[PDB]
């Protein structure tokens, strides 16, 4: 079986390159961030513009939802993160502590902590309630491209331009694992699998890899796309067929069969690099977003 | 930001 993703909506609004798109855990909303310093909220099913959330002083590289869909956290070149109440649009807290651009962010599954990665080569853990920095991890020797909590929040995974993925004990800050394969290209993205057994990592040699992080073994590689320059997100699609989804620097969305590693679909439409993709939590819907020559977000739907 | 490299 292959999917049949077809374009349903194109979402215009951002005035510069879009940096990230994320579906709310409750399925209602899509959040986008951009180089234009704005966060936008859109209906997940119709693509209907909902509102703009404003306050960062420079471009935003990432945005992420709390697990109850009530909050967002964003990571900006202004060297802050901001925690937002989505319903009111209020900036609840500004997280100050990184010494350089903040590139990536996530809540833990409980949503009492935030993890952040920066050009300053650190990973930081923040208290959501107080907005204060709890721990700074001297994590990497180059900018940190992605950070993510595992299923129970006991671990953090980080990736970096230094060529490493690392696994951190949330509680102690100890480095529990370093992962790298036979070459040392920059690692541009990483996340845990939905079941928490694997990490999915992108490297800037046109390769996605699925790792068993506990055994430290690469189990699958996904290739065929173009990724040598940008920090492009990748996803597990789990609502229908079990796929891997990623943008690409040839302006397409790539979808692979997770088990077989074969390309099952390529989505054509964007006019620039597809920097970010996201998969809806319950319906077979992909959101894709593109860089400065395009500026749009697209919603695609499949029967499986 | 992410939108430049």
Name all domains of chain A by residue range, CATH numbers in brackets. Answer: 1-304 (2.130.10.10)
Longest dimension (CA), chain A: 49
* CB within 8 Å: A19 and B5: no
What are A118's strand-pairing partners?
Answer: A102
Element of type H or E holding A290: strand A285-290
Cα separation, A40 vs A50, whole angstroms: 8
CB contact under 8 A, B3 and A17: yes
Q: Looking at CA atoms only, how far is residue B4 from chain A in angstroms?
A: 7
Q: What is the dihedral of CA A168, A171, A174, A176, to 10 degrees?
A: -50
Q: What is the resolution of this structure in A?
A: 1.7
Q: Is A144 on the interface with B (CB under 8 A)?
A: no
Q: List beta partners, residue A146.
A: A159
Q: CB within 8 A of A294, min separation 6: which ones? A: A251, A270, A271, A272
Helices (H) and strands (E) in chain B, counts: 0, 0
- Cβ B1–A77 below 8 Å, yes or no? yes
Q: Classify the C-alpha dihedral A230-A236-A239-A240 as positive or negative.
A: positive
CA A46 – CA A8 distance, rounded (Å):
8
A275 to B3: CB separation less than 8 angstroms, yes or no: yes
Q: Is A67 exposed, middle or buried (0-12, 13-18, 19+ CB in 10 A)?
A: middle
Residue pair A114/A105 in contact (Cβ under 8 Å)? The answer is yes
Edge-to-edge strands of the sheet including A6-11?
Answer: A6-11, A297-301, A285-290, A274-279
């Amino acid at each position: 079986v292959k999917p049949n993703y077809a374009l349903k909506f194109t979402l215009a609004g951002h005035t510069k390159a879009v940096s990230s798109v994320k579906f709310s855990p409750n399925g209602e909303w899509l959040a986008s961030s951009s180089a234009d310093k704005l966060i936008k909220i859109w209906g997940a099913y119709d693509g209907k513009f909902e509102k703009t959330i404003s306050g960062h002083k420079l471009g935003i590289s990432d945005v992420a939802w709390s697990s109850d869909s009530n909050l967002l956290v964003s990571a900006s070149d202004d060297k802050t993160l901001k925690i937002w109440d989505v319903s009111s649009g209020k900036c609840l807290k500004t997280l100050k502590g990184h010494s350089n651009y903040v590139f990536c962010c996530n809540f833990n599954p409980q949503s009492n902590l935030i993890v952040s990665g920066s050009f300053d080569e650190s990973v930081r853990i923040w208290d959501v309630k107080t907005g204060k920095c709890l721990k700074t991890l001297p994590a990497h020797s180059d900018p940190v491209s992605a950070v993510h909590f595992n299923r129970d929040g006991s671990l953090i995974v980080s990736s970096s331009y230094d060529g490493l993925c690392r696994i951190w004990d949330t509680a102690s800050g100890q480095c529990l694992k370093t992962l790298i394969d036979d070459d040392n290209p920059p690692v541009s993205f990483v996340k845990f699998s939905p079941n928490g057994k694997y990490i999915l990592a992108a490297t800037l040699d046109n390769t996605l890899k699925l790792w068993d992080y506990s055994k430290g073994k690469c189990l699958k590689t996904y290739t065929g796309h173009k990724n040598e320059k940008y920090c492009i997100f990748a996803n597990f699609s789990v609502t229908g067929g079990k796929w891997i989804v990623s943008g690409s620097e040839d302006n397409l969305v790539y979808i692979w069969n997770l088990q077989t590693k074969e390309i099952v679909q390529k989505l054509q439409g964007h006019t620039d690099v597809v920097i970010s993709t996201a998969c809806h939590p319950t319906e077979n819907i992909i959101a894709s977003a593109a860089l400065e020559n395009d500026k749009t977000i697209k919603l695609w739907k499949s029967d499986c | 930001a992410r939108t430049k490299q």
